[PDB]
TrEMBL record, chains A, B, C:
Name assigned to this protein: Probable enoyl-CoA hydratase echA8
Top-level taxon: Bacteria
Organism: Mycolicibacterium smegmatis (strain ATCC 700084 / mc(2)155) (Mycobacterium smegmatis)
Species lineage: Bacteria, Bacillati, Actinomycetota, Actinomycetes, Mycobacteriales
Function according to Swiss-Prot or TrEMBL: Could possibly oxidize fatty acids using specific components.
Family: Belongs to the enoyl-CoA hydratase/isomerase family.
One function term, GO molecular function aspect: 3-hydroxyacyl-CoA dehydratase activity
Amino acid sequence: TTYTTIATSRPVAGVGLIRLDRPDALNALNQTLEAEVLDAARDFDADLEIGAIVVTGSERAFAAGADIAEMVTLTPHQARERNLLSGWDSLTQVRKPIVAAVAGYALGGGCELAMLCDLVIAADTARFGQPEITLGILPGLGGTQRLTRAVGKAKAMDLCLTGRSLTAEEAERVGLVSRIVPAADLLDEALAVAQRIARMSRPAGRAVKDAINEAFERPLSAGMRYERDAFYAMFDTHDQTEGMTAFLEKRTPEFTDR
Amino acid sequence: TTYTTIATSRPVAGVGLIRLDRPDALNALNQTLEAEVLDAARDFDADLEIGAIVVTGSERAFAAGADIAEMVTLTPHQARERNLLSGWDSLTQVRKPIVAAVAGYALGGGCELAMLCDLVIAADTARFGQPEITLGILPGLGGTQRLTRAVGKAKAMDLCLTGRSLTAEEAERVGLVSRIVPAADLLDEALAVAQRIARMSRPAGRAVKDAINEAFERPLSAGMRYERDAFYAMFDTHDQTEGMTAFLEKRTPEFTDR
Amino acid sequence: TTYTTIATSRPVAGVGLIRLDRPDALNALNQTLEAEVLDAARDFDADLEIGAIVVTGSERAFAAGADIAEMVTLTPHQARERNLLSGWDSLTQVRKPIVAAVAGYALGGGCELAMLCDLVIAADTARFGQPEITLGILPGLGGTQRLTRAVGKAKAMDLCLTGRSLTAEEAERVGLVSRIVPAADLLDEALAVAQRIARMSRPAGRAVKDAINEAFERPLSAGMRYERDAFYAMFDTHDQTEGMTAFLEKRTPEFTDR
Ligand code: NA
Ligand code: NA
Ligand code: NA
């Protein structure tokens, strides 16, 4: 498939890479980019050879905002009738893990894109913010929901009311990102993390991702019941027997389940 | 209005300041102070010229506890019949943002007051704790609820079972506060943050605050739906058009919505 | 009672210690150990002289995993019919506080054991991970539920998909543990913390623990109502009068409630 706003590749075995490529717009999220990222991610999710997906931007910007030239003329009814941002919501239904590799600006919709991914690997140059209020709006893709759950009320209120950014260091300290690495090492780290995930059991990876997502949907008691049911069900798989037998036999597992 | 336990002022444009002023009691929260803070905050919320509110104590204490001389004689039925602490609950219904500027002791009800605010700016001298257990009670104003949500179970259990305090540094590290600054810079930082918020769109500020509060009331899926509806509705406002147009025209926005 | 996988003691006044003792297995959690820890904890909970419980392993391992030799042959129906891990769930019903004192490896079920406790005191040597995916399974004792609630999605996804460990330092930074101390000081710190808790009001300790646990079961509004009811009820106790009177009289309280 040919894309106009992104570049896709398979840079290492088992990993699909989606690189945002609107450099004139600092990778601002527009409607085309939304559809193209969703399409690419769905193709990677359907590809048996791929175990994990990486989303990244440029050295300068993961994504600096949603595209404001596109949003300025929007009305409430048009936003609702077009189901605006629903493509990004659909991205949360991809079953394989998605690793955001964030360099430079991840602002507004770009911060929200990083937060909707499963892991975030941040360059030391990464800056995370929700400056929607400065434009007379509020976040619409989880900047008030996923951010608050990750970093707490006091930091979420500061970001979303003042427009300030967090540095990568601060973001890691308060739970927004998985890891920080030097900027020159960002893509290598993200590809290595993604390949490690891709070498793991496929059904176990899906189960982990599903269960962590479910942690935000239920009270703890019900989440524990959900996780316990998922755990029992893993014992139905070939990969469970192989993984545990390999451990006990001090050898590498050969996972085969789809 | 004349107050007996607080001092109110408008120190910079767009900002209302509430300073707790019971120095003999280290600003312990009594019934009078509760009613006076609520009254002052409601007046600032109704004042069109004000965009944000700051609550602060003295250099020595934001508030060291609820007033124990007042609580010692309390019975369960009197506490329930008087709706004790309901004024502080009402403070959560103020629509404009509230910034807590915390120096020195914020203990017990004082820590809870900081946590019920939207942002917390802490002096490096700030100390946060919930020593209710040492008095034979437990927190009654969110010291087990807002604290746990901010800092996690292990730190909340430590504070509320052992009576220890967190330093400002520790509090920031685990998500209890928005920012730390040197003690001499605390009021300047809080007033600057509050004025920045007051320069933002009024309906967008209310929407941000409401949506972040809603993050603690719903599972993520339903919170995302709530936030998406709020986002669509912002496109109904003059401030959205002005904010986005100003961005695109590389100029300062002139927000006008009430 | 004689135990085969643990050693129990009363090392300081008011504290019951449970030491995991399967050194050949690095304290891996098997069925026997589960039942023995539950039994010991229930005995300490019923002992009027005990105010807090400490669970610890060896210098090398708090617990390195669930016992894989035992799980390798498990089927989904046998896991469900045996109510596997239900003993650990029952441990959450112990009313007195439980302090995990973690040195060295706390992996898999061992990390989950630390997270199900109320406080975690970590040696600087502590390592926390959920490497279940490497065995073809997922966590079944809260490694996707309690971990996510403590540290956030990005870190929980990293741990549970990549199998990496957090250092004690990292774990404290993101909210997984209460305190870090040098390895040589771990048991002293944990016993001192536990004795401090044991010197507090018994009903107030139970109420604190219950309310913090309830923070994960309800939306904030309902959690605040729960906590407010619990607070009113504390004024029914002798310990509340004694604790507050002692404060006001600048003396040590003599708590007596059971
Ligand atoms: Na099996
Ligand atoms: Na519009
Ligand atoms: Na009483």
